[PDB]
Amino acid sequence: GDLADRFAELERRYDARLGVYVPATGTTAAIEYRADERFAFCSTFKAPLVAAVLHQNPLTHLDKLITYTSDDIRSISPVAQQHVQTGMTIGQLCDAAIRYSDGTAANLLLADLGGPGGGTAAFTGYLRSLGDTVSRLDAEEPELNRDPPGDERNTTTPHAIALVLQQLVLGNALPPDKRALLTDWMARNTTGAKRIRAGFPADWKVIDKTGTGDYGRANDIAVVWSPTGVPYVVAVMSDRAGGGYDAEPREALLAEAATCVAGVLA
Known part of the structure; x- marks a missing residue:
């Protein structure tokens, strides 16, 4: 067979552009x-954003009230819209940014990284330090979601972001005690049940x-573990620019691409 033909069919059926990267392993x-x-x-930037913050700070930083x-x-x-009066610790902001995709938490984490673009340059610099020559972040929430397709300023590639996540979760970009935090927040994400999760059997983590x-953008970046505990990184990205800026995103496309990947990996 040819997997590429099958991804091409998803594009036809959902009227979408699909990008997929799963890094090679010792056996795949x-x-x-x-x-x-x-x-x-x-x-998707909020995962590596949390890593950048962890990287730069001791664990005690997580207790710092913002x-x-x-x-x-x-x-x-x-989350952040219910804690204006009390504020939120860096740890709570990390939690919200990943598990609830909280945009204010991300903006505050960017300010925590520091510098121009409210932290966007620091973020991009962190990516450069992981070997990512491709990705760029120029804007904050919410503008970063709303660029036209031809603007590269807040873009990554499936390949680039997969290898970033590979280093962060399965590699040694972070020491174990910081790697554990990122892993756990992503593990307990609330927003992803209809995407990569829906494409893997329940005995996979x-x-x-x-x-x-905008432009029907739906992305999911994941790390998955077989029932035997063998890990893989799966990046799936999608858009639907032919339907205009208000094209409906299609979680189903991600779920079905994930299903195709699961067929290959199982």
Whole structure:
């Protein structure tokens, strides 16, 4: 058979552009499909954003209380919009950014990284330090989700973000005690049940971070473990630029691409 033909069929059926990367292992080939094409990060950036913060700080930093106002709620913030009065610790912000895709938490984590673009440059610099020459983040929540397709300023590639996640979760970019935190937050994500999770059998472990935006953008980046405990990284990105800026994102496309990948890996 040819897996690429089957991904091409998903594109036809969902009227979508699909990008997939699964890095090769000691026993498996890479899965790649438009893996070097650019796709908007959307909220997938929040996974490596949390890593950047962990990298730069001792664990005690997680207990640091961050204060903010209602006027800082400029994006979808399921958690931060209920803690304006008390504020939120860096740890709580990390938790919210990943598990609830909280945009205000991300903006505050970017300010925590520091520098121009409110932390966007620091973020991109972190990616460069992991060997990512491709990805870029220029804007904050919510603008970073709403660029036209031809603007590369807030884009990654399935290949680039997969190898970033590979280093962070399964590699040695982070020391174990920081790697554990990222892993766990992604493990207990609430936003991903209809994406990569829905494509793997229930005896596989799935950790993930979603992204959604304009032009029908739907992304999921995951690390999965077989029932035998063999890990793989799965990045799936999608958009539907032919349907305009308000094209409906299709979680089903991600679930079905994930299903195709699971067929290959099982």
